[PDB]
Design a protein around this ligand. Structure first.
Ligand SMILES: CC(C)S[C@@H]1O[C@H](CO)[C@H](O)[C@H](O)[C@H]1O
Ligand SMILES: CC(C)S[C@@H]1O[C@H](CO)[C@H](O)[C@H](O)[C@H]1O
Ligand SMILES: [Mg+2]
Ligand SMILES: [Mg+2]
Ligand SMILES: [Mg+2]
Ligand SMILES: [Mg+2]
Ligand code: NA
Ligand code: NA
Ligand code: NA
Ligand code: NA
Ligand code: NA
Lengths: 1015, 211, 174
């Protein structure tokens, strides 16, 4: 019958004998436990060691397994994904379905997980009431047997499936048998861009309820105009036998204080001609001056729902955290408690590099802490309902949540093929309706989402209206079909750019500024996805935030995304390395596209995270003469855990510092006048830095937390004093092959065949391993690479244009190499042409001036042919002989920064270990650049000028040639890249050119100057 | 939905048709117990979607109905929007939950009187003249059922028609109903007679209310 | 499977193997016949004399009935309501359900109409294309078998239920 019906190939059967969905239950039999959220003896965990056997198909499972343990089975921890235990390979595919697209059919080879548990049930649980099993997450579908008897069936990987086991259990030893199918008709609705895994990956629990029970409860909070009065409305539903003596009490608590209470017998108001709900009641509680919930101040109350008898005997209690907040759209603005939100959001998948898609509390808290510490106030559940604890944590820590239905049909052609099909409406409706029924009481959830990347079908319109009808308290959004369809309250595009239109047919991505004012358009715009943080990315992130702040109806967005979906593999010596698509024999696959995070999989930050933090700052600063103006972007809180540290430094040398307490009302301004600063004697640029510091620890941060910072140039004194002339004079030695410059024991060698500084000497120690040459290329970032365009690779991608123009193959041709003796210096003049098969790409003209002081002044003038694609960089490189421990620089830092991602970096004197000047991106690329650098120190060398640089033990060539970071080997000496100019990194998306025009090297003629000397 | 030939005949002879989904849950307590329940949405959706897919090409079909006497539930709102989305060419009506809910483009009460209010709790039947001008109301009013023609009836039929002609937004209605649902039985003499509820041993029954 | 699954007591199962709904089809192989709305050779009526046996419950139906005619069956006109042929009583109730309100369950004593038809199919219909059966209205739910083999299931008394019979039919008698 089970093998005969094939319920996993029928979108009309999404469950059999599954109980109704509901908010989180614990069936407390003690009111104080419910109030204080203590554990409940009526809610047991079945997590721990289970038995597991893997089969290639459900037809291969022996019938004996229903009755007793398979000797061949292993003992595994549950929850788990079975790919994480190595029973088969996890698959990384983005858009293309991991199975042949033939709905509703799945492959006959369907990996099957056979889970079983032998466990005790006490007779007291069976003597009365109802015992149910709860599977919080099973991927992708499953049948359930209890003591050899079939119980039911479930689909939807991301919401709990519950079954009444009351008639199946015996007192004493019981056995569960769970047959989990990797593929089902549900998989067609689960095409999210992530690892495709399977198994019992979320909690399993047993819940005992009395026969007469609270079956559902809904909490709403409505307010007066100024939010000084609230009504809390609680609708309560029961199951079992109705009796006149039954009562529902709802009490509301602030800490240990009961704030309000209401009691009523069952019997709802008249609904229609047939009467009302005899099995429901609605309690209304008045609350004066409620403490309001926000991400800023997550004020929470506790509501306790008691089912009891008139004489005061408790039957059972349930409870939830209540956050008094109103979400509404009015006049084109999304308001929370009357105030326009600015969403500092991120998309977050549930991912662990060891445990796969199994979530644990520690990882969840770590993510929330890091989010809040980096000025995020909002998270999108991309693209499925989360582990239930996630919402409890967001309620308490204070984050705005977009709860999203587990529906994505990205790989369909066209994308709406299923979602326009009425045959798929039931299956889609359950994914939406069961999420709402589960999560509707969480205050952190402020917006519902209908799913992701499933086009726009009539099924979306139906389910949009269903949500609007059952829950008017939360806007509904959905991006599919062009981001502004009739199924969305919010214009919610993905990767729409700030100023640049991308007018695709049918589904254009308008520039976000333009989008708001299209004829007839009134809604708020919040990007559901933007700033694709794949690898070295988040270029142009500041452009988004400038527009967010300037335009009221641009209310932010959610970065894609939080955490790299890299998985851990082990080499022969047991050393872990980070793996991505294809590393498990999974094919077809989308390689490194699973890694788009602001943090690595182990939650170590990428440099891009600091740019996010800075741009999402909650205080804005302006400087006018002596006065600093601080503006608060908080909506609800005063700045009561904030002080402003200011610091004035001359070229990194502190000159004055101080601190002022911040007392800024929400949306307010404070004026801080600095003291009149003493005049510095020496030349250089004064820099003002201000930090906002949180003196007191919070639930989410340590004492001393820096939340905001800003820098300005103050007065500059130009160096006018003549460098007191040295008496020494360098000597020119000329041979046919070389120009050699000599000063004391210092020697500079210029090769006359190549035209490059080929070697330098201090005494008898060589300084270079490779000659100092021009470099116009970088090891391609993920943004440079893009995607494959079916029959070939996209010719529009930066890497493809560079390769086609012969940038990586370009060979230097010497045009001129001359030497001149001056009064107190030797002048070397060179010119090179870089050519590809007869076409001149670049001309470099250099002068090298070596004087008595031992300094070599390099002047570089470059012509770039207007018809060659703009080059990745205009700079010089060499492999230095020395490996030193520290790198010291006066410039932007301390972290990696690029021309379109350097707003977070500060100008100062920085000192780091060499290893910190390399960014360990899992997919290797150009990395570790620091911009606006005036002085660089490494070992015996000092370079001065105005440049960008990176420095590491890996050549651009190796980075370019290596697919994984663990495969990188330190080279002899140290590779130095010094750029006069470096192209932006982009990142608006990672599958098309995204470097903005002002960050491309398009000027045609470039000049930079550099001084190389010994320090 | 009717036998498919009905719509062909209405196309050709010329009658305006309200096509109505096969959903009536009158005997539930309260009336919307199933239609507000998301577990019943799939079964309900099929009765609406499959009607629209069958009948959408008939010119005689000018209005879609979501069913009859099933209260007002969230499933009605979903299915109302589904129809507006797939077929913008036809208004959608539904009488349940008070005749003027968010699930109807047309105020479509049953047995609302001309001048007399019937102020039932939750689901009042206002006078039709009064209903039109209720604060914020703009929709046309067309009675889905009026003038209950049971036996010696249609008293005051003129009163409806006077109002229909006078008020532009009173655009008429559908009499209840066309044909007596009596069945033929045979006695001892083998002579046919007209039978109603109870006459087949059927019990409980509602007697002559089928006529 | 059929008696075990009890699809008639499950609001999540409204059909099995039923084809998508669509506007009226006739599948004319001649454009002029289509234009003039004349009969189509590809649309046959199965109305007429069928075999029928009444049972008090689906459990009471003999397995043999799938394979061959039941001797106790009567020959009846279809389309028909079996109450009009006197097999059980038609019930007139207005609001109150004729069954106990206990959704989704129905009485165990659930009158069951066992219809059958022996009919012929042209060999040409089977050598090419797709042959479907169309039930314009069946009240209130039904399972369908063809040549002893289970085809599918349908609900909603007032809309056509269509099933693909191509793999079930043989040339000649079915
Ligand atoms: C590559 C695009 C055509 S689809 C693109 O893929 C991304 C890869 O991280 C994300 O999954 C985005 O949501 C999706 O729009
Ligand atoms: C008797 C009323 C309470 S219900 C009333 O019954 C009528 C009897 O013909 C019709 O069926 C109407 O549609 C219905 O509203
Ligand atoms: Mg299925
Ligand atoms: Mg996708
Ligand atoms: Mg704990
Ligand atoms: Mg059924
Ligand atoms: Na804004
Ligand atoms: Na991705
Ligand atoms: Na590489
Ligand atoms: Na009129
Ligand atoms: Na009647």
């Amino acid at each position: 019958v089970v093998l005969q019906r094939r319920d996993w190939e029928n979108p009309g059967v999404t469950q059999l004998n599954r109980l109704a969905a509901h908010p989180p239950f614990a069936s407390w039999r003690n009111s104080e436990e419910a109030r204080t959220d203590r554990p409940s003896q009526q809610l047991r965990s079945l997590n721990g060691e289970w038995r597991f056997a893997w089969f290639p198909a459900p037809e291969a499972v022996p019938e004996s397994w229903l009755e007793c343990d398979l000797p061949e089975a292993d003992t595994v921890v549950v929850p788990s994904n079975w790919q994480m235990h190595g029973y088969d390979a996890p698959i990384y595919t983005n858009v293309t379905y991991p199975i042949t697209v033939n709905p509703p059919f799945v492959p006959t080879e369907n990996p099957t997980g056979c889970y079983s548990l032998t466990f005790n049930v006490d007779e007291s649980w069976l003597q009365e009431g109802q015992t149910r099993i709860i599977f919080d997450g099973v991927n992708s579908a499953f049948h359930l047997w209890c003591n050899g008897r079939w119980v039911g069936y479930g689909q939807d990987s991301r919401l709990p499936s519950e079954f009444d086991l009351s008639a199946f259990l015996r007192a004493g030893e019981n056995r569960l048998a769970v047959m989990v199918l990797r593929w089902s008709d549900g998989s067609y609705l689960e095409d999210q861009d992530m690892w495709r895994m399977s198994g019992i990956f979320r909690d399993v629990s047993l819940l005992h309820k009395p026969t007469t029970q609270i079956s559902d409860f809904h909490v709403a909070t409505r307010f007066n105009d100024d939010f000084s009065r609230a009504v809390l409305e609680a609708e309560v539903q029961m199951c079992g036998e109705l009796r006149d003596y039954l009562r529902v009490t709802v009490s509301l608590w602030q800490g240990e204080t009961q704030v309000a209470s209401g009691t009523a017998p069952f019997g709802g108001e008249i609904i229609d001609e047939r009467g009302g709900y005899a099995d429901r009641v609605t309690l209304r509680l008045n609350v004066e001056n409620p403490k309001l919930w926000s991400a800023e101040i997550p004020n929470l109350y506790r509501a306790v729902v008691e089912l009891h008898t008139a004489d005061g005997t408790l039957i059972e209690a349930e409870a939830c955290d209540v956050g008094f907040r109103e979400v509404r759209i009015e006049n084109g603005l999304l308001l929370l408690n009357g105030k326009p939100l600015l969403i500092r959001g991120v998309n977050r998948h549930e991912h662990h590099p060891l445990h796969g898609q199994v979530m644990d509390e520690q990882t969840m808290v770590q993510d929330i802490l890091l989010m809040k510490q980096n000025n995020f106030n909002a998270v999108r559940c991309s693209h499925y309902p989360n582990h239930p604890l996630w919402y409890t944590l967001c309620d308490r820590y204070g984050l705005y949540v977009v709860d999203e239905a587990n529906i994505e049909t990205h790989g369909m052609v066209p994308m709406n093929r299923l979602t326009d099909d009425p045959r798929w409406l039931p299956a889609m409706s359950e994914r939406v309706t069961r999420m709402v029924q589960r999560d509707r009481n969480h205050p952190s959830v402020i917006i519902w989402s209908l799913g992701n990347e499933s086009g726009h079908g009539a099924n979306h319109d139906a389910l949009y209206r269903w949500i609007k009808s059952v829950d008017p308290s939360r806007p509904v959004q959905y991006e599919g079909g062009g981001a502004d369809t009739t199924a969305t309250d919010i214009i919610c595009p993905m990767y729409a750019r700030v100023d640049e239109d991308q007018p695709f047919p049918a589904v254009p991505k308008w520039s976000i500024k333009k989008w708001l004012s299209l004829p007839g358009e009134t809604r708020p715009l919040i990007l559901c996805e933007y700033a694709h943080a794949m690898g070295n990315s988040l270029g142009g992130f500041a452009k988004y935030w400038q527009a967010f702040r300037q335009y009221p109806r641009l209310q932010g967005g959610f970065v894609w995304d939080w955490v790299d979906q890299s998985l851990i593999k082990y080499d022969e010596n047991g050393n872990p390395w980070s793996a991505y698509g294809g590393d498990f024999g999974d094919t077809p696959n989308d390689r490194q596209f699973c890694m788009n995070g602001l943090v690595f999989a182990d939650r170590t930050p990428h440099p891009a995270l600091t740019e996010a933090k800075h741009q999402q700052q909650f205080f804005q600063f302006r400087l006018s003469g002596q006065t600093i103006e601080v503006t608060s972007e908080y909506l609800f809180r005063h700045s009561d855990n904030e002080l402003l540290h200011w610091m004035v430094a001359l070229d990194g040398k502190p000159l004055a510092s101080g601190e002022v307490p911040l007392d800024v009302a929400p949306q307010g301004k404070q004026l801080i006048e600095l003291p009149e600063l003493p005049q510095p004697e020496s030349a250089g640029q004064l820099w003002l830095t201000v930090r906002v510091v949180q003196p007191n620890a919070t639930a989410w941060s340590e004492a001393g937390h820096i939340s905001a910072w800003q820098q300005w140039r103050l007065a500059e004194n130009l160096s006018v004093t003549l460098p007191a002339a040295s008496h020494a004079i360098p000597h020119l030695t000329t041979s046919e092959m070389d120009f050699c410059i000599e000063l004391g024991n210092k020697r500079w060698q210029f090769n006359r065949q190549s035209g490059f500084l080929s070697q330098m000497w201090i005494g008898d120690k060589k300084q270079l391993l490779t000659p100092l040459r021009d470099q116009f290329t970088r090891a391609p970032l993920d943004n440079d690479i893009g995607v494959a365009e079916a029959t070939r690779i996209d010719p529009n991608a930066w890497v493809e244009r560079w390769k086609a123009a012969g940038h990586y193959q370009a060979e230097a041709a010497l045009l001129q190499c001359t030497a001149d003796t001056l009064a107190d210096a030797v002048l070397i003049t060179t010119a090179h042409a870089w050519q590809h098969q007869g076409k001149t790409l670049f001309i470099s003209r250099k002068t090298y001036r070596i004087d008595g002081s031992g300094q070599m002044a390099i002047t570089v003038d470059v012509e770039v042919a207007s018809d060659t694609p703009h080059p990745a960089r205009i700079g010089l490189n060499c492999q230095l002989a020395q490996v030193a421990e520290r790198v010291n620089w006066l410039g932007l830092g301390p972290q990696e920064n690029y021309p379109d991602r350097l707003t977070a970096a500060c100008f100062d004197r920085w000192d780091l270990p060499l290893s910190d000047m390399y960014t360990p991106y899992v997919f290797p690329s150009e990395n570790g650049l620091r911009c606006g650098t005036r002085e660089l120190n490494y070992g015996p060398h000092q370079w001065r000028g105005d440049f960008q640089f990176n420095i590491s033990r890996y050549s651009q060539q190796q980075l370019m040639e290596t697919s994984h970071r663990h495969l990188l080997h330190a080279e002899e000496g140290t590779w130095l890249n010094i750029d006069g100019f470096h192209m932006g990194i982009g990142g608006d998306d990672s599958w098309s050119p995204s470097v903005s025009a002002e960050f491309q090297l398009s000027a045609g003629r470039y000049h930079y100057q550099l001084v190389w000397c010994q320090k």
